[PDB]
Amino acid sequence: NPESADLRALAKHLYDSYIKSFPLTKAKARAILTGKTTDKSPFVIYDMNSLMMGEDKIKFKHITPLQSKEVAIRIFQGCQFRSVEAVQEITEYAKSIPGFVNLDLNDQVTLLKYGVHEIIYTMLASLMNKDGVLISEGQGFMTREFLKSLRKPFGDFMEPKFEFAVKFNALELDDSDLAIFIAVIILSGDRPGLLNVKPIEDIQDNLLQALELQLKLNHPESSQLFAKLLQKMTDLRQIVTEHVQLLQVIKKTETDMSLHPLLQEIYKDLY
């Protein structure tokens, strides 16, 4: 019908920009994880020694890592580099969301500030399984056991992301779905400190209809996938709160570690 059509248009526009904005799709990640691909299988990192041997191979967008720190801290500086780049990818993606760039700039800031961690978690799920997580465009694979093995507080950092991911991955969402879900997360009218909620909520209501239509068309066998997904989005805010707490700890207790300025902006006065 006429309204459906506009919502299908939004879904496609969003998928297109998602594909342009983010380097590694869920499609490719799964192909890499299953062993269903023509590419060279990822270098596995499971201890201090394998990290060091694999550091040569772990390029991201043609950026070579720098060639003396303990395992835990080096792992954290890498996840930090990737996060910064993700924030930048998510910001470009947000700008492609119709109506977002017409919002008050201070509110664009606030939506990103609170949205980015939720989205990062969502997109981590695409790269994870029970065994571990793909890194750096899928050239590496870091075992969950290894990450859990790190000295505290770093040992408890990735584990909740894994716990969330095994449950979220059950919904079997694909890239066309995720593209819409991510936009819905960004356009959340209840972020603290927003100035003008109404045009945010109007955009989110279209996005949510687009999401609902998308899930009916793309997963016609899946009963109320839409409702399940919305329940997960609410779990996920609690989980971002725990993570921000853990970084509060890490900033204070681990003085040998420079937290990147972009990330400081985001974590400051958050929960």
Partner: peptide, 10 residues
């Protein structure tokens, strides 16, 4: 939020 601002105006 100077960087975020800068990324948004970029």
């Amino acid at each position: 939020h100077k960087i975020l601002h800068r990324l948004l105006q970029e």
